[PDB]
Amino acid sequence: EDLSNYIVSNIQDPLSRTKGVGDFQVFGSQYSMRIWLDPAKLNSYQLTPG
Amino acid sequence: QLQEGVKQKAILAPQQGVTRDLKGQATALVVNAQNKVELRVIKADRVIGDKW
């Protein structure tokens, strides 16, 4: 996923500006702010993921 | 501002010397004894004015 973010970040910008290159896909996609909940801390504060 | 503890062995990297890379970690560029630039991963707790 680090390599896929590196591709979509800064080798997809010079690649598609060249001549002749049509549409294309990459394996995976860019990053995402993945937030990891845990149920013990949600119990400890009287919280729910909603 | 509560005050607690002293660390007698602490290192204060400057703010200009450490820069977040594209993942989210903190990386600082160091040199070796063989005079070649190497990257080292940093974790940083506090800020004191202008230093990490």
Side-chain angles (χ1 to χ4, degrees), chain A residues 2 31, chain B residues 22-23:
Chain A
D2 195 359
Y31 278 181
Chain B
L22 56 92
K23 185 184 286 185

Side-chain angles (χ1 to χ4, degrees), chain B:
Chain B
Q1 295 181 358
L2 268 291
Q3 183 178 1
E4 53 89 18
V6 289
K7 289 179 71 174
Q8 293 180 357
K9 184 67 180 294
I11 295 96
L12 277 76
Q15 289 181 356
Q16 293 86 17
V18 60
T19 304
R20 303 294 182 93
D21 56 354
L22 56 92
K23 185 184 286 185
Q25 294 296 110
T27 61
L29 296 174
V30 304
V31 301
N32 288 318
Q34 293 86 17
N35 195 0
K36 188 178 261 77
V37 175
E38 190 179 3
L39 188 144
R40 292 183 184 272
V41 62
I42 305 300
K43 69 181 182 69
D45 292 331
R46 301 288 183 184
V47 286
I48 300 97
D50 285 325
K51 293 181 185 293
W52 290 94

Side-chain angles (χ1 to χ4, degrees), chain A residues 36-50:
Chain A
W36 297 106
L37 298 176
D38 53 353
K41 298 291 181 68
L42 292 173
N43 192 6
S44 178
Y45 292 156
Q46 283 82 17
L47 288 172
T48 184

